[PDB]
Amino acid sequence: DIQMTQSPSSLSASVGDRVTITCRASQDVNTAVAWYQQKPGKAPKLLIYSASFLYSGVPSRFSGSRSGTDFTLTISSLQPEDFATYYCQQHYTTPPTFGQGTKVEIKRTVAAPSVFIFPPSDEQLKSGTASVVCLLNNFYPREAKVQWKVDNALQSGNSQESVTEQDSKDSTYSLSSTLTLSKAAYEKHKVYACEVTHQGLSSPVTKSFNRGE
């Protein structure tokens, strides 16, 4: 019945920056608050217990504090390995409740994507479907616009995107866009192009191929 309102939902900071995440309990929870870190694909990890105590093995850059119903997690010097989602939790009453989470990404300089386009393989075509893949490699920031053009006509509803988690070594993202067509529709057109707009590019970059050539 006790809610934990966590803010912000996401934040970006550079290596070495001081990061602040806050959590407001809907009523008094004394010091029965914990903070957790969760990295992609891993179980949550305890950082702070009893509002302000650093848990065993946790780097000293993490700290917690309390003021009334307001709880604060601080990272004094943000590191690249700190890319994760952070969660507050109260256990003053049952059920224990979690905050909604704060996604923390590492800020870095703008980097333009390297763009690649892949036609469907001849093996896939024999199966009856055609997938066209556009790759945006190692870019920052995450926001990017990728449009498909088939015979110079803009496509809608036939592509899906996927984005990697931030790279641990250079803090970039990579992105795939996949255009799916029937084999019959694929063979009815010539020019397949993916046009990429990104902050790191002076003007949109287009990679294309002509079917069969």
Added chain:
Amino acid sequence: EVQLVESGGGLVQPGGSLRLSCAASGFNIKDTYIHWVRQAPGKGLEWVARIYPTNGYTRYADSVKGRFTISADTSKNTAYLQMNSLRAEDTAVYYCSRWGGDGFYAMDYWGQGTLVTVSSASTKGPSVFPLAPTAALGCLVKDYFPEPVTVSWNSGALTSGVHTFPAVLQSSGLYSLSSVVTVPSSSLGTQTYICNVNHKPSNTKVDKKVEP
């Protein structure tokens, strides 16, 4: 050291039953509360249930009350989550944890999690197609169910520059992903590039050579 190890997850039909186990090492579960906490795909953490194994007292989240039963066997140092009347909304990674120091240390140890997928869809192994070619190359791992799949390159010898994308759910209800890698253009045509795809739920293993 303290360990919590889950088992028992997998793919189950809606309306079905499944029992998870949480095996504790390095401490006695008689001393603590044991919890189950779950995480739906792309969502946050949700507490499910707790038990105090010494007297078997239990508490449940309203979302699972009556349908799920948490239990424990102190002589096996193991706790259990019996799930019944399973619904698609129950699809999640299920974690077990403990209250450390009677709660003072909060949830200080967690298991690795076990994925529970509630769906009427049948298992299906992936089709693997080459993404033929600094140059980029890759493999398209298409039309599989359920999660997860793993991808390596050259049996683990190629790791730098690899990006294996998170799977997307297609309109057909099947998953699809690509794994790519950037390599020196000078290596094409002589150096062999093989993607190693494993889909344990369907017992499918594919090694696909990617040729220019």
